[PDB]
Design a protein around this nucleic acid. Sequence first.
DNA 1: CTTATGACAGCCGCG
DNA 2: GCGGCTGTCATAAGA
Length: 890
Amino acid sequence: MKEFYLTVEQIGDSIFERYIDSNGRERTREVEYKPSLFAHCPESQATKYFDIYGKPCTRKLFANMRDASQWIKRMEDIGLEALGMDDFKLAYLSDTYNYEIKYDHTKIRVANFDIEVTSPDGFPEPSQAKHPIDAITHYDSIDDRFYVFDLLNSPYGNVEEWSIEIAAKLQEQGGDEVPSEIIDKIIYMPFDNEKELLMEYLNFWQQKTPVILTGWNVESFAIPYVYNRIKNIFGESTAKRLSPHRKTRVKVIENMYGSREIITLFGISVLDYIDLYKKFSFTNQPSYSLDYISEFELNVGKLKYDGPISKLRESNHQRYISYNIIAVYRVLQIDAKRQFINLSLDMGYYAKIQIQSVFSPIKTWDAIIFNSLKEQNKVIPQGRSHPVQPYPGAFVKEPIPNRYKYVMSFDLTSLYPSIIRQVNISPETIAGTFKVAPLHDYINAVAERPSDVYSCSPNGMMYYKDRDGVVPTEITKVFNQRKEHKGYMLAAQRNGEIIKEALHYRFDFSDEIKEKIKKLSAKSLNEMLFRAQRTEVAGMTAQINRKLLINSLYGALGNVWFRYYDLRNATAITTFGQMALQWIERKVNEYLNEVCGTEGEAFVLYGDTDSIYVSADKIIDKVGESKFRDTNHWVDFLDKFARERMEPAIDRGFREMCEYMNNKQHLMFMDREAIAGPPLGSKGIGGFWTGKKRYALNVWDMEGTRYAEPKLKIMGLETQKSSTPKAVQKALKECIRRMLQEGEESLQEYFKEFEKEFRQLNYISIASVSSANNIAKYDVGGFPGPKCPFHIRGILTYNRAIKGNIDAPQVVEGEKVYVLPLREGNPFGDKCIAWPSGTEITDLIKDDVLHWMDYTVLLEKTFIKPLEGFTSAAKLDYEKKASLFDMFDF
DNA sequence: CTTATGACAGCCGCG
DNA sequence: GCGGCTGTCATAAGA
């Protein structure tokens, strides 16, 4: 097999790399790497090395890496560019691995672990590690085994051993329902004391040292906890054994109010799963805990247990340990679904970076561009320092707040990356400046053509048109690779099924390879379909990773810490987008006025960053609503009209803009997204806007896919807000469903009924939610001080009423919290109360809270008020005989 | 982050 | 005694 790296670290003047050798064995090596860096030289001197500006550069080889750094500082002090890859780990990887890295995941130790720490006095802080580690479940991907470490004796109890037998049994049998898939894979180790467990774990760690170390919240908790626990007990020198190179950096990151401890374990790649999810699932989840995410992804979640976690070990050690086994397994299941680790390995090996740098677009892009330019003997720029200077961003239109009966939306694809390639934006491609007219002038073609020589963005910038820019080239390359790998994708995935359906690879091979294959087999047709499906697996991941690069380019480009950052270019990109969405609002409005025989009608009712929303009202009126045999008939009509009449007019429009800005190539393409409207022959309103980023739509067709039942596309509204009570999210969604599909009378009936039935709803279902941030800041001795927000006052009411019970769950800084208003004259002595979320409120006050809460204020605050928002905008009433003069701001 | 809106505190001015 | 309006805060929604 072809050699590939596992981890890389620079320590002093050495690279410490762990890598898989040519056979497949994991080994480690220490190289005294000699980096090269580059300086500008006379045109007299001949090299093969040029900077991206075409200026010639001397390659300077250094005896070691400390000579290189000291040269850079010394070159900085003189005032001359010191160019080339300043991060030597990367430059090393580029040197040692000058080929397309093929990697065998089978030879990469991916560790999955979670610990348990019984704490009777609140959250066990990792940087303290006050309390003993009583359970460690560590999953190893090579042995494919769950190594379970069980503390039998601790200050908090002596417990029996965990039973594998009981664990397997059903819930109703007294069992833990530990999945049969893992029962023969658990390896169990009880211990008599914490010292033995920890040292056996550490000795386990040296034998089976992780390459990729993952698991839920491991980077914020499990890892610092273990390190500090071992540090504090055995000495720092023992805790450092947790690194295959015995070097650890202790880092304290700062927040929006506080800080956090992270431990860098040199020679290991920490890919916390809570980060691998946030990064590459793309789903704005309301809670990022493992219970939720696991329920979401697997509909199974974490193991249930009676009582507080802090009393679990003594009351039910059996549940406790299995709880810890399932936790790890849950994580492994999610990854069996999403493949986020393999995604990371693929990206990390593609860009040739440390795998943990996948969370950095800057690092990933820098390397991709570095390797690319190195291959053509080019030299990258020195990272220049830059003042963080806000520039203009995405355009969003003010919508006139209204009901909107028929809407079609359109989206420019990859707007920003597309703009880069279209205008040819790149540091070295900057041609010059032109006088800037107001943006609206360029938007209306009224302005003077900026240049007939150079490619242009309406921010005043001019770019070389002939040249191939670094940035535009490197992104085009990724676009191409995307198409390519989606090519093998839609081949092994598409042509593959021909082999599968017959039983009853990158390109669909000639009808001689497909011909000589027709003999029904158990060794062939059904075991060679395993190949075609495993091939498309590779297609997906390669394509997802290209998509991820494409979208995370502007972010890197807009970051002052990026080698290729340039404020005028960032501003060029976004300003160009700003004109492009609005130029096409003009072009669509003009086309639709011509076609409809109207003049000066606002068809585009909303536009946001890369997409427009278009009223289809008059287009329907042209046919007249009455010629459609059903809903699906007009959805057909509008779809055809879009693809046939509207999109060529859109393309004609953008082609005109391209000639106007004099761009290198025309890459402004709009797909048609949603088609929305009411069900035929109904009183529904279809859709409505209340303002920027707030709207609901009744959608029948999202780009191609024609839905069975209609589905609500709701954006920004209270339904989409975790702060909204469970019951109330539900009702407002219904309120909206009823508004759009059924009409005003439906809504009024629903409103009346819910209002009538409010007090019979669960108190948890009707309590609002919010995060507890800056709890101290407004805590004036347990009472609310100046400027104190409503929910924190709510907490400081719970506290005073609760200061004295240890059984009572304390409210912690950071924690999400149920809030409830309280009726005047309440014992609790305040306008509201708040308690920890996802929990029933303690019996000590519960029955008295349920008595004092203000239903009127609650319903008004969380339901009626935001409803009034929707109905006001949609020109509807949620109850009869509402005087129409309310509409006016007298 | 940049684009946002909305809940709520607290100012100022209002015979 | 509330509008009007600025500032903290919470949270989308796509990067």
